[PDB]
Design a protein around this ligand. Structure first.
Ligand SMILES: Nc1nc2c(ncn2[C@@H]2O[C@H](COP(=O)(O)OP(=O)(O)O)[C@@H](O)[C@H]2O)c(=O)[nH]1
Lengths: 194, 193
């Protein structure tokens, strides 16, 4: 019944850690439409409203065929998030940007969190989050700090629903889902296994 | 010349096949869209001298490994007359993913299932005629199967494929848009030593 915030990012980007910070727990929830796996999930008060956070498996390619990538698409297809809170490791920004841009092409509602930003600056990495936000057309926040500003932006991004956005997102996944369906189909018929 | 792109995952016997098809005479060469040198050789298939290019093994057509980026860049700027796709039969349950990603580009494809004997001993029974029918792509098993595979390749080079180059490039433009955006944002917003 509550609006859904999905945590999305690559593996080991601090997602479970952020989840624990937001919820104060490590609750796992199963019986999600479309997937059999149990995921870290919890509901929080965000201002006056209650919202549901779900930590999605870390993945490298939105359109890839690793098991985690399949699970993420199934979840997103059948449980279109009201917000994708995309977590990027500042220290590895060059290598992590692709997932963000892929998710943006799904036509989801996104807020970007640039994690480990101090560690980045301790190396020689400087990030202009205003410029990044400007070019992306997406809110971008750095976390060292930055957390309360990030939550504020979450509330703003959930304030006005978009009719037809579930159908839009489902449609952008269809091509990957077709490949998967064809795999299952052809393997079931043409390949016999022990 | 006509061009065949040899495509498969790593450790599928692609190197040994390319060596055989090119008779040991392959040389290094540069190609538009990539800065790396690739190996290619000549082979006579029916009426045509054909150039076969050995592309780096990849796992995910849309992934961001260096090899994957080179294969996509190569394909975009050098659309092959035939993609010759080599899968490991024992790992057919997963490796089907790359074949279907490549089909989705609207390429002209022949599939070779290598190590088909090993697969049968693992208890994996593949019915390649049925698989060919369902894919609408010719499928041939190797272990020997080489002559038959190469006659299908020759046949797959005969019919017209009008607009294909345009179709393949169009299908790859999603990937190139991601890459273009990545560069744009990284240049303007990020300074790394
Ligand atoms: N420097 C820094 N490290 C973090 C932060 N959040 C998580 N990490 C570390 O990143 C690694 C992976 O964290 P985790 O929550 O397990 O990532 P997950 O796989 O995405 O859930 C661990 O070493 C964490 O302690 C952060 O805000 N700053």
């Amino acid at each position: 019944q509550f609006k859904r915030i999905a945590l999305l990012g690559m593996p080991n980007t601090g997602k479970s850690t952020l989840f624990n910070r937001m919820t104060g727990g490590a609750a796992r929830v199963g019986n999600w439409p479309g997937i059999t796996v149990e995921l870290l999930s919890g509901k929080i008060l965000l201002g006056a409203d209650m919202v549901e956070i779900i930590d999605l498996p870390g993945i490298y390619d939105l359109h890839g065929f690793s098991d985690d990538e399949q699970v993420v698409r199934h979840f997103l297809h059948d449980n279109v998030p009201d917000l994708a809170l995309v977590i990027l490791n500042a220290t590895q920004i060059e290598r992590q940007m692709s997932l963000l841009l892929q998710l943006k092409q799904l036509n989801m509602n996104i807020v970007v969190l640039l994690n480990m930003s101090d560690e980045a600056k301790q190396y020689g990495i400087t990030i202009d989050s205003r410029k990044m936000s400007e070019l992306l057309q997406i809110p971008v926040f750095q976390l060292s700090t930055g957390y309360q500003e990030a939550l504020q932006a979450v509330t703003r991004a959930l304030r006005y629903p978009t009719p037809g956005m579930a159908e839009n997102v489902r449609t952008q996944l269809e091509q990957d889902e077709h490949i998967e369906a064809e795999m299952v189909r052809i393997l079931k018929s043409a390949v016999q296994i022990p």
